[PDB]
Design an enzyme around this catalytic site. Structure first.
Site, PDB file in Angstrom:
ATOM      1  N   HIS A  69       0.826  -1.146   0.084  1.00 53.58           N
ATOM      2  CA  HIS A  69      -0.112  -0.058   0.073  1.00 53.58           C
ATOM      3  C   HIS A  69       0.917   1.372  -0.110  1.00 53.58           C
ATOM      4  O   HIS A  69       0.374   2.423  -0.298  1.00 53.58           O
ATOM      5  CB  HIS A  69      -0.966   0.040   1.136  1.00 53.58           C
ATOM      6  N   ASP A  93       0.017  -7.622   1.616  1.00 59.68           N
ATOM      7  CA  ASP A  93       0.374  -6.185   1.378  1.00 59.68           C
ATOM      8  C   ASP A  93       1.781  -6.254   1.544  1.00 59.68           C
ATOM      9  O   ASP A  93       2.420  -5.357   2.323  1.00 59.68           O
ATOM     10  CB  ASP A  93      -0.186  -5.409   2.848  1.00 59.68           C
ATOM     11  N   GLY A 149       2.950   6.727   8.596  1.00 56.82           N
ATOM     12  CA  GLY A 149       4.401   6.669   7.939  1.00 56.82           C
ATOM     13  C   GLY A 149       5.127   5.825   8.370  1.00 56.82           C
ATOM     14  O   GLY A 149       6.522   5.878   7.849  1.00 56.82           O
TER      15      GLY A 149
HETATM   16  C1  LIG Z   1      -3.697   2.542   2.960  1.00 55.28           C
HETATM   17  C2  LIG Z   1      -3.365   2.377   4.495  1.00 55.28           C
HETATM   18  C3  LIG Z   1      -3.231   0.923   4.829  1.00 55.28           C
HETATM   19  C4  LIG Z   1      -4.571   0.267   4.890  1.00 55.28           C
HETATM   20  C5  LIG Z   1      -5.409   0.830   6.031  1.00 55.28           C
HETATM   21  N1  LIG Z   1      -4.297   0.782   6.988  1.00 55.28           N
HETATM   22  C6  LIG Z   1      -4.617   0.902   8.377  1.00 55.28           C
HETATM   23  O1  LIG Z   1      -3.759   0.916   9.256  1.00 55.28           O
HETATM   24  C7  LIG Z   1      -6.154   1.238   8.773  1.00 55.28           C
HETATM   25  C8  LIG Z   1      -6.328   2.449   9.236  1.00 55.28           C
HETATM   26  C9  LIG Z   1      -7.928   2.591   9.703  1.00 55.28           C
HETATM   27  C10 LIG Z   1      -5.658   2.968  10.534  1.00 55.28           C
HETATM   28  C11 LIG Z   1      -6.280   3.379   8.152  1.00 55.28           C
HETATM   29  N2  LIG Z   1      -6.108   0.012  10.028  1.00 55.28           N
HETATM   30  C12 LIG Z   1      -6.727  -1.030   9.704  1.00 55.28           C
HETATM   31  O2  LIG Z   1      -7.129  -1.467   8.665  1.00 55.28           O
HETATM   32  O3  LIG Z   1      -6.695  -1.902  10.886  1.00 55.28           O
HETATM   33  C13 LIG Z   1      -7.409  -3.184  10.733  1.00 55.28           C
HETATM   34  C14 LIG Z   1      -6.957  -4.100  11.661  1.00 55.28           C
HETATM   35  C15 LIG Z   1      -6.398  -4.469  10.308  1.00 55.28           C
HETATM   36  C16 LIG Z   1      -6.851  -5.502   9.401  1.00 55.28           C
HETATM   37  C17 LIG Z   1      -6.771  -4.999   8.067  1.00 55.28           C
HETATM   38  C18 LIG Z   1      -5.251  -4.942   7.394  1.00 55.28           C
HETATM   39  C19 LIG Z   1      -5.262  -4.353   5.974  1.00 55.28           C
HETATM   40  C20 LIG Z   1      -4.112  -3.900   5.801  1.00 55.28           C
HETATM   41  C21 LIG Z   1      -3.956  -3.295   4.198  1.00 55.28           C
HETATM   42  N3  LIG Z   1      -3.739  -4.183   3.148  1.00 55.28           N
HETATM   43  C22 LIG Z   1      -3.385  -3.904   1.991  1.00 55.28           C
HETATM   44  C23 LIG Z   1      -3.271  -4.511   1.046  1.00 55.28           C
HETATM   45  C24 LIG Z   1      -3.254  -4.111  -0.307  1.00 55.28           C
HETATM   46  C25 LIG Z   1      -3.454  -2.635  -0.705  1.00 55.28           C
HETATM   47  O4  LIG Z   1      -3.502  -2.647  -1.999  1.00 55.28           O
HETATM   48  C26 LIG Z   1      -3.738  -1.145  -2.177  1.00 55.28           C
HETATM   49  C27 LIG Z   1      -3.840  -1.900   0.284  1.00 55.28           C
HETATM   50  C28 LIG Z   1      -3.718  -2.219   1.613  1.00 55.28           C
HETATM   51  N4  LIG Z   1      -4.121  -1.605   2.761  1.00 55.28           N
HETATM   52  C29 LIG Z   1      -3.968  -2.063   3.708  1.00 55.28           C
HETATM   53  O5  LIG Z   1      -4.223  -0.963   5.076  1.00 55.28           O
HETATM   54  C30 LIG Z   1      -3.298   0.661   6.543  1.00 55.28           C
HETATM   55  C31 LIG Z   1      -2.132   2.003   7.121  1.00 55.28           C
HETATM   56  O6  LIG Z   1      -2.693   2.962   7.326  1.00 55.28           O
HETATM   57  N5  LIG Z   1      -0.999   1.683   7.703  1.00 55.28           N
HETATM   58  C32 LIG Z   1       0.009   2.402   8.243  1.00 55.28           C
HETATM   59  C33 LIG Z   1       0.615   3.327   7.753  1.00 55.28           C
HETATM   60  O7  LIG Z   1       1.696   3.932   8.316  1.00 55.28           O
HETATM   61  N6  LIG Z   1       0.526   3.512   6.494  1.00 55.28           N
HETATM   62  S1  LIG Z   1       1.407   4.802   5.903  1.00 55.28           S
HETATM   63  O8  LIG Z   1       3.072   4.399   6.057  1.00 55.28           O
HETATM   64  O9  LIG Z   1       1.108   6.328   6.429  1.00 55.28           O
HETATM   65  C34 LIG Z   1       1.388   4.863   4.217  1.00 55.28           C
HETATM   66  C35 LIG Z   1      -0.327   5.146   4.182  1.00 55.28           C
HETATM   67  C36 LIG Z   1       2.434   5.543   3.308  1.00 55.28           C
HETATM   68  C37 LIG Z   1       2.090   4.117   3.179  1.00 55.28           C
HETATM   69  C38 LIG Z   1       0.380   1.574   9.408  1.00 55.28           C
HETATM   70  C39 LIG Z   1      -0.584   2.456   9.687  1.00 55.28           C
HETATM   71  C40 LIG Z   1      -0.337   3.687  10.713  1.00 55.28           C
HETATM   72  F1  LIG Z   1      -1.128   4.508  10.122  1.00 55.28           F
HETATM   73  F2  LIG Z   1      -0.819   3.310  12.001  1.00 55.28           F
END
Ligand SMILES: CC[C@@H]1[C@@H]2CN(C(=O)[C@H](C(C)(C)C)NC(=O)O[C@@H]3C[C@H]3CCCCCc3nc4ccc(OC)cc4nc3O2)[C@@H]1C(=O)N[C@]1(C(=O)NS(=O)(=O)C2(C)CC2)C[C@H]1C(F)F
Ligand SMILES: [Zn+2]
Length: 191
Positions: A69, A93, A149
């Protein structure tokens, strides 16, 4: 689309963890377009960026891993030009490239400990109690902004071995109480 670019690292080599920037925003933008990054790479945890996002990437067993992601199917910039992903798994992911020359790799954890430590892009080392194959609770919850991030960063055991890759946060009213991660065994199977 441009390449993922290494723009810094989390220094874990001493007694104090701290973030280091190795490339600023303008150089990042240019390096993303060319895919040619001549900077020296060091350490286990890299800070990486695209044109639109910034997150982390972690070297384990000679592969630099991060989240789909953040990186999508993108190449990573390298001294010889763009390097194509060696692993891509949207269902986990998860993506990976050959680890850059100069990086150091973490070793997969084999000790089974449930006392974990999450390393963030700000070089916070956050204690996490493992609660399942892919989940752990923060000992001290905090606003989700502190974890934004840091996807692609490591969860480590007390011996400093890799237990997982941070993937997602469990948030209630903006407070992160738990984290969700890719277990290192999923990486080992991928390999
Ligand atoms: C796009 C964000 C992803 C989404 C939503 N998500 C969340 O954490 C959400 C939130 C509500 C917090 C939003 N929680 C949440 O689903 O919890 C439920 C309990 C789990 C079970 C589900 C897990 C799903 C994982 C996932 N599998 C994917 C696979 C393919 C894909 O293909 C496109 C996209 C995918 N997307 C996915 O997840 C992720 C996220 O934000 N990850 C972090 C981050 O830091 N990213 S980032 O570096 O800022 C960035 C964005 C620059 C890169 C660590 C947190 C940090 F913020 F804490
Ligand atoms: Zn261990």
């Amino acid at each position: 689309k441009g390449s993922v670019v290494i723009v810094g690292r989390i220094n874990l080599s001493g007694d104090t963890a701290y973030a280091q920037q190795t490339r600023g925003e303008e150089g990042c933008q240019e390096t993303s377009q060319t895919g040619r990054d001549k900077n020296q790479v060091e350490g286990e945890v890299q800070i990486v960026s695209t044109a639109t996002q910034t997150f982390l990437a972690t070297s384990i067993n000679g592969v630099l891993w991060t989240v789909y992601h953040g990186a999508g199917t993108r190449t990573i910039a390298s001294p010889k030009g763009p390097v194509t992903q060696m692993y891509t798994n949207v269902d986990k992911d998860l993506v990976g490239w050959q680890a850059p020359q100069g990086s150091r790799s973490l070793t997969p954890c084999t000790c089974g400990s449930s006392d974990l430590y999450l390393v963030t892009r700000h070089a916070d080392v956050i204690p996490v109690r493992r609660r399942g194959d892919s989940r752990g609770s923060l000992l001290s919850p905090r606003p989700i902004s502190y974890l934004k991030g840091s996807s692609g960063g490591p969860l480590l055991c007390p011996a400093g071995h890799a237990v997982g890759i941070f993937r997602a946060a469990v948030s209630t009213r903006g407070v992160a109480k738990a984290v969700q991660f890719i277990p290192v065994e999923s990486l080992e199977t991928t390999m």
